[PDB]
Amino acid sequence: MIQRTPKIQVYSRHPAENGKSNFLNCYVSGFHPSDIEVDLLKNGERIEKVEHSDLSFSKDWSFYLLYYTEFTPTEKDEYACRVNHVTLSQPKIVKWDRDM
Amino acid sequence: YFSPIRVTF
Amino acid sequence: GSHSMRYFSTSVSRPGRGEPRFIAVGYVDDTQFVRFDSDAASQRMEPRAPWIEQEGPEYWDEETGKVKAHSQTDRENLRIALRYYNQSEAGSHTLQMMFGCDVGSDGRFLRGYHQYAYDGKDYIALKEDLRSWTAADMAAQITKRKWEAAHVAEQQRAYLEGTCVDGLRRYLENGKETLQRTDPPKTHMTHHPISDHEATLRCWALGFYPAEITLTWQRDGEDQTQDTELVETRPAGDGTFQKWAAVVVPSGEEQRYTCHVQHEGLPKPLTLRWEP
Ligand SMILES: [Mg+2]
Ligand SMILES: [Mg+2]
C-alpha cells in the first residue's frame, strides 16, 4: 500500500518578539494514511489547549493539518512539536527556531 | 453546494 | 480574477472500532468555508468562514442531507473496493473524493473536477471534457464501465456546469469583502553567520493571500539553486500564508545575491538585496 511520511514545520504566526503575544504552529503535510499524533511542547511539557484544523488533502491526495496554540515568547522558554505516524519508527521532535 | 450525485463503485 | 471551489472528502475504515469516519471540507480558493465530521457532536454541515453564516436554515438542512448521504455511499464503496481488490475485513483503508469547479472573472464556467483515490492511489477520475473517465487499474475499470452504462458523466457535468458554479458565484458575491482580496507579501531579509567563512541569507514572505508565490535566489543576476533551501508554503493560521528561501554565501559576498519575489498582489516582482 502507498504510505507517505509527514513533512513537519514548527513556526510562529508572526515574527517572534519577546513579550508580545503570538501563535505557535505545527504544520504537518504530505502524509498518508490520515492518522497522526501531534503535540506542541513548552519546555518539554505537552501544551494542553491545542486546537487543529479540519482534515484536508492536496492534489496528490496527501493529507495536511495545522496545530496551533497561543503563546508569548521569552528568551528562555523553549518550544517544540512532537509528531508520530505509522511511517515513523519513533516520535519526531522538531524544535521551534524563531528564525525559521 | 455539495454534489448531489451518489453512485456506487 | 478566476476562482475555484473544491470539496475534499475522506472516509477511513477502522474494523473493530465502529463505522468508518467521514470528514468533508469545502474551500473557495485557499479559504475553507464548511466542514462535516461524522465523529463530531453536531452531525450537521457547519460554517467555517463568516460569509457562509448568512445562508438560511434550508441551506444547512440540504447540505447536511447531501453530505450524510454521501458518507453512507462511500461506506458502501469501501466495501466494494475490498471485494475488487481481494482484501480482508481486518485492515483499515482510505477512500478520498475531490470535486469542484472553476469560474472566470466574469463568473462563467471554466473547468470541473470529480475524482476518487483508494488507499492513497488514483482510482477513477472524470476527464477534463466531463464526458469520459480515466480508470487507474483493472478494478477501477469495473466502476468505469458501470458509470458509463448509467451515464454518470452526464449527471456530473450537469452539476459541475450548473449548481457547482451557481454556488461558487454566490459565495464569491456574499464573501466579496475577503475572497477577492490579494494581500501582497510583507518581505524582509535576515543574515546569520554560520562559520568564519559562510553566512546564511534568509528571504521571508509573510502575510500573503492567495497562497501561490515564487521565491528565487540570484547571484550576479543569474539563477542560483545550489546551496539554497526553500520551505514549503505554510498557513499562518489567520488566513494568510508564509514562505522563506535561504542561501549560504561566502562571507563578504552578500551583496552579490538577490531574492526575487513574485505574487499576484505585487504591482511588480521584487528584487531584494541584503540591507546592509
Ligand atoms: Mg481509463
Ligand atoms: Mg467576507
AA letter at C47: P
> Among candidates C133, C135, C172, C137, which has minimal Cα distance to C156?
C133
Beta bridge partners of C188: C204
The residue type of C249 is: V
Using an 8 Å Cβ cutoff, are C250 and C264 in contact?
Answer: no
Residue C66: which of B4, B7, B8 has the nearest Cβ?
Answer: B4
Rounded distance between C-alpha atoms, residue A50 and residue C77, angstroms? 34
**Strand pairing class (C214-219; C121-126):** unpaired
C259 within 8 A of C190, measured Cβ to Cβ: no
Cα torsion through C217, C220, C225, C227, rounded to 10: -90
Question: Are the beta carbons of C187 and C261 closer than 8 angstroms?
Answer: yes
Which residue on chain A is closest to C117 by alpha carbon? A61
Taking the CA of residue B1 and the nearest CA in chain C, the distance in Å comes to 6
Residues of C in Cβ contact (< 8 Å) with B5:
152, 155-156, 159
Interior CA angle at C212 toward A36 and C100, to 5°? 70
Nearest CA distance, C236 vs chain A (angstrom): 5
**Where are the strands (E) in chain A, listed by range?**
7-12, 22-31, 37-42, 45-46, 51-52, 56-57, 63-71, 79-84, 92-95
* Interface check C24 vs B, CB under 8 A: yes
Cell numbers representing residue C48 in the block: 467555517
C-alpha cell at C218: 540570484
Name the structure determination technique. Answer: X-ray
Contact A39, A96 (CB under 8 A): no
- Interchain proximity A11–C242, CB inside 8 Å: yes
Q: How many residues are there in chain A?
A: 100
Give which of C145, C150, C154 is closest to C124, Cα–Cα: C145
Distance CA C217, CA C243 (A): 13
B chain contacts of residue C63, beta-carbon cutoff 8 Å: 1-2
In this complex, is the C-beta atom of C142 within 8 Å of any C-beta atom belonging to chain B?
Answer: yes
Yes or no: say if C272 and C187 are a contact pair by the CB < 8 Å rule: yes
**What is d(CA C21, CA C71) in angstroms, rounded to the nearest whole number?**
8
**Residues across chain C:** 276
The total of other beta-carbon atoms located within 10 Å of residue C24's CB is: 27
Contact C73 B6 (CB under 8 A): yes
C-alpha distance from residue C142 to each of C70, C82, C139, C156 (Å):
21, 13, 6, 18
Distance CA C132, CA C227 (A): 46
User: What amino acid occupies position C39?
Assistant: D
C94 part of contact set with chain A, CB < 8 Å: yes
Give the residue among C124, C24, C20, C26 at the shortest CA–CA distance from C72.
C20
Grid cell 503575544 is found at A21
C252 touches chain A (CB under 8 A): no
Determine the angle formed by the axes of helices C57-84 and C138-149, rounding to 10 degrees.
Answer: 130
The residue type found at A4 is R
Considering every ligand atom, which ligand is closest to the CA of C137? 1
- CB contact under 8 Å between C152 and B3, yes or no, is no
Q: How many CB atoms lie within 10 A of CB C166?
A: 14
Q: Specify the pairing of strand C234-235 against strand C241-250.
A: antiparallel
